[PDB]
Amino acid sequence: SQQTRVLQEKLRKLKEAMLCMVCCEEEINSTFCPCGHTVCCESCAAQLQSCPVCRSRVEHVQHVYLPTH
Amino acid sequence: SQQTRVLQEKLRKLKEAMLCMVCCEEEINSTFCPCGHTVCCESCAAQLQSCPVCRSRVEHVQHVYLPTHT
Numbered sequence: 198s199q200q201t202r203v204l205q206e207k208l209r210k211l212k213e214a215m216l217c218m219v220c221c222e223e224e225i226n227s228t229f230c231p232c233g234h235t236v237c238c239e240s241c242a243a244q245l246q247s248c249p250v251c252r253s254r255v256e257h258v259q260h261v262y263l264p265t266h
Numbered sequence: 267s268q269q270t271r272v273l274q275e276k277l278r279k280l281k282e283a284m285l286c287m288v289c290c291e292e293e294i295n296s297t298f299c300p301c302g303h304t305v306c307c308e309s310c311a312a313q314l315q316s317c318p319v320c321r322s323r324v325e326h327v328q329h330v331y332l333p334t335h336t
């Protein structure tokens with residue numbers, strides 16, 4: 198039905214929000230510290246000197262283990 | 267249809283996986299450092315000395331801003 202299409206859309210959007218904002222291919226699993234934006238995979242986060250959301254300098258990257266992984 | 271019921275279940279389970287493992291009510295938004303387990307809300311994480319998943323000492327809690335946050 199149309200509700201199946203709506204739910205497929207919500208599920209897709211929630212899954213897309215768990216993907217890296219830079220490469221769009223790998224799951225987010227990394228946090229820029231100290232700002233706390235958690236928007237990248239480990240490969241993209243290793244290559245950024247400043248946060249792509251707030252432009253704060255990245256002092257270090259913290260790997261995150263999420264139950265959604 | 268039955269497909270609608272299946273999708274509603276997947277959506278619900280994914281949303282439940284984003285809730286605090288201690289209170290089950292607030293969204294996960296905190297990370298235990300250095301281990302990196304990110305399974306609690308700010309209130310529940312604030313009073314844990316060791317990680318509830320791996321027992322590593324919590325040196326500090328890092329707040330996390332996630333795109334899934336609602």
Ligand SMILES: C[C@@H]1CCC[C@H]1NCCO
Nearest residue numbers: 198201202203205206269
């Ligand atoms: C977005 C498309 C339009 C037609 C069918 C729909 N996808 C439904 C998946 O259940």
Ligand SMILES: C[C@@H]1CCC[C@H]1NCCO
Nearest residue numbers: 213214216217218221222
């Ligand atoms: C529409 C989403 C935003 C981030 C990832 C993208 N989907 C990419 C799938 O390869």
Ligand SMILES: C[C@@H]1CCC[C@H]1NCCO
Nearest residue numbers: 282283285286287290291
């Ligand atoms: C079934 C899920 C696991 C964690 C939270 C729980 N739902 C609680 C909603 O109030």
Ligand SMILES: [Zn+2]
Nearest residue numbers: 217220238241
């Ligand atoms: Zn990436």
Ligand SMILES: [Zn+2]
Nearest residue numbers: 232234248251
């Ligand atoms: Zn930032």
Ligand SMILES: [Zn+2]
Nearest residue numbers: 286289307310
């Ligand atoms: Zn909690």
Ligand SMILES: [Zn+2]
Nearest residue numbers: 301303317320
């Ligand atoms: Zn841990």
